[PDB]
Each structure stands twice: as structure tokens, then as C-alpha cells.
UniProtKB/Swiss-Prot annotation:
It comes from the Bacteria. The chain holds residues 227 to 282 of 448 of the full protein. This is Immunoglobulin G-binding protein G. Binds to the constant Fc region of IgG with high affinity. It is found in: Secreted, Cell wall. The gene is spg. Sequence repeats lie at residues 21-75. It comes from Streptococcus sp. group G.
Amino acid sequence: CYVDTNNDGAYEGDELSGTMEYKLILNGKTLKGETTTCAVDAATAEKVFKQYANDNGVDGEWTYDDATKTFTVTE
């Protein structure tokens, strides 16, 4: 997965360094949904995932499977 830093939906240069796609799943009683995000490093995506769950205001059991680079939040 590639990520562009120009927002031109086109990969060219460092944008072709190699990114990582992750599936962010939020399981909440009041907030339930799913999504996906790509980042250069799981570190960046992590902060994105943590920011996402926080944006939902849902917190509980956080579980991630590197087998599919997917995170699920159980409230």
C-alpha cells in the first residue's frame, strides 16, 4: 500500500517507499463501525487508531491482529 503526501492520489517519489494498511474496527454499544487507514509505520497508524477510538469516545478492550494488521475496540 502506498501513501501520497501531496494529496494528488498519486504515488511518486517517497510515496512509493512502502506503506501499511490497517483495519480500524470500533465495537461500541453507542458507537459501532469500521474503517481502514494506511501509514508509513504502525506507529503513525497506531496514533491514528487511538485517535479514532477516542473520537468515538469508546474505550474497553483493545485487540490487534498483526496477521491482518487489524484493530478492534470492544466496549
